[PDB]
Design a protein around this ligand. Structure first.
Ligand SMILES: [Hg+2]
Ligand SMILES: [Hg+2]
Length: 454
């Protein structure tokens, strides 16, 4: 209620310790802080974790109570609800290991609980579909920033982190700082009166750009007709038909983005999906393989790589993709029968699911409505990156595994290039033979974070 003043009190922080493989990490914890005045669901609380040194007027890794980065990791995947995380958490989903390590590194951690597509209110009504996920994320950020003087850590040093849909969440938070679109929702919730722009973005396999993900997925995977996920199926003739068309539309969609390489060239595709853009994707995968190759990895686990001497000199992209195989059916995101996580994400309190593309709406196999166009745009990070603003984070780190079939490589790549083209800081890679996952590279994420702030 309005009785909740959203004022953090450091006296709430209580001492805890966790074993970190070979070390005891000392920290303080304050849990279950209601970060808005009018929450609609029990999941909307946040946890705060602070390196113990900061309660003692002491230091960690060059950081102190006033200056420490604030890592804001989330637990969201598949656009499902993400519970407030905890270094003591053993229940799925959780990044407790990442949190333990962040604390060891001197970062303040604010782990906020986030509504998702299956979330219901006290009346059994759905309250977690779009744009619930990002509203909650923003509200948590506002709580932190409103509480700058009282919450340990520098509120101007907030760095979000997430994997998959959580990566999209992290990316959207960075792109959309202080967007007016979300104001009515944040006001209806009674969020803290503060800004929600952040300092830096960490994103693993962000599942974003949903309205173009079907085109990208088929551009990558057309010609490979069996799919295998969690079960192993084969594409029907209808799906093969939709696939070939979806692939072609991607070229049109890609060319008009006017993406540029470092030399300033327009990155493009022809009617067959071949061209300088495809070449860029290939080079990032070659680069990925070389790094792995240099470490003594057997890259011929997958097909297509050409090795000359000690160098990966080329790659048969089609052979590689064939060996990697195919995870999702067609369309991969906007299912004609509305059965995808994203369909459900775009539903609302009346409709369990909606389409989010004209093609899938036109070809729907069930009665359906199309999601509001403004909403689709609003939850796409690219929407905010057509320009250089203050509200967009300056620093980005994006990772998508080179063995990851949850979305086309083109999706995170487009994001990275757009960020580069519009002058934002962007650190991008496709780490070799990494599955659907995140936080497997903390030494590098933390060195990157330290690089921005020290
Ligand atoms: Hg992934
Ligand atoms: Hg700093």
């Amino acid at each position: 209620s309005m009785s909740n003043r959203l004022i953090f009190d450091a006296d709430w922080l209580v001492p805890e310790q966790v074993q970190v493989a070979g070390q005891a990490i000392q920290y303080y914890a304050a849990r279950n802080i209601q970060y808005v005045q009018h929450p609609v669901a029990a999941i909307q609380v946040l946890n705060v974790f602070v390196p113990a040194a900061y309660l003692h007027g002491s230091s960690v890794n060059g950081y102190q109570r006033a200056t420490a980065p604030i890592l804001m990791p989330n637990t969201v995947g598949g656009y499902l609800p993400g519970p407030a995380d905890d270094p003591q958490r053993v229940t799925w989903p959780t990044n407790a290991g990442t949190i333990q390590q962040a604390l060891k590194r001197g970062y303040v951690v604010v782990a906020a609980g986030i509504r998702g597509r299956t979330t219901v209110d006290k009346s059994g009504q759905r309250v977690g579909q779009a744009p619930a996920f990002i509203v909650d994320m923003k509200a948590a950020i506002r709580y932190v920033k409103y509480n700058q003087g009282r919450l340990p850590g520098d509120a101007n040093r907030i760095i979000t982190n997430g994997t998959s849909a959580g990566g999209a969440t992290s990316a959207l938070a960075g792109a959309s700082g202080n967007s007016a679109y979300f104001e009515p929702a944040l006001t209806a919730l009674g969020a803290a009166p503060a800004t929600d722009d952040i300092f830096a973005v960490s994103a693993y396999c962000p599942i974003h750009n949903l309205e173009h993900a079907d085109m990208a997925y088929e551009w990558q995977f057309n010609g490979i007709n069996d799919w295998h996920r969690y079960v192993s199926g084969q594409l029907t003739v209808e799906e093969q038909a939709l696939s070939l068309a979806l692939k072609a539309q991607f070229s049109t969609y890609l060319n008009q983005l006017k993406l540029t390489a470092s030399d300033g060239t327009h990155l493009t595709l022809n009617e067959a999906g071949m061209g300088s853009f495809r070449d860029v994707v290939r080079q990032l995968l070659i680069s990925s393989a070389q790094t792995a190759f240099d470490q003594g990895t057997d890259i011929h686990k997958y097909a297509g790589f050409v090795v000359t001497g000690n160098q990966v000199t080329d790659l048969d992209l089609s052979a590689y993709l064939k060996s990697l195989t195919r995870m999702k059916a067609v369309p991969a995101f906007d299912q004609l029968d509305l059965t995808s996580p994203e369909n459900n994400l775009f539903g609302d309190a009346t409709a369990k699911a909606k389409h989010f593309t004209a093609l899938a709406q036109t070809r729907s196999t069930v009665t359906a409505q199309l999601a509001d166009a403004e909403l689709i745009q609003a939850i796409n990070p690219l929407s905010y990156l057509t320009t250089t603003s203050s509200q967009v984070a300056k620093h980005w780190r994006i990772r998508h595994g080179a063995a990851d079939r949850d979305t086309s490589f083109a999706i995170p790549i487009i994001l990275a290039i757009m960020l580069e083209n519009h002058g934002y800081g962007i650190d991008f890679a496709l780490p070799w033979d990494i599955p659907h996952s995140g936080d497997y590279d903390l030494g590098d994420l933390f060195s990157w974070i330290d690089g921005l702030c020290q």
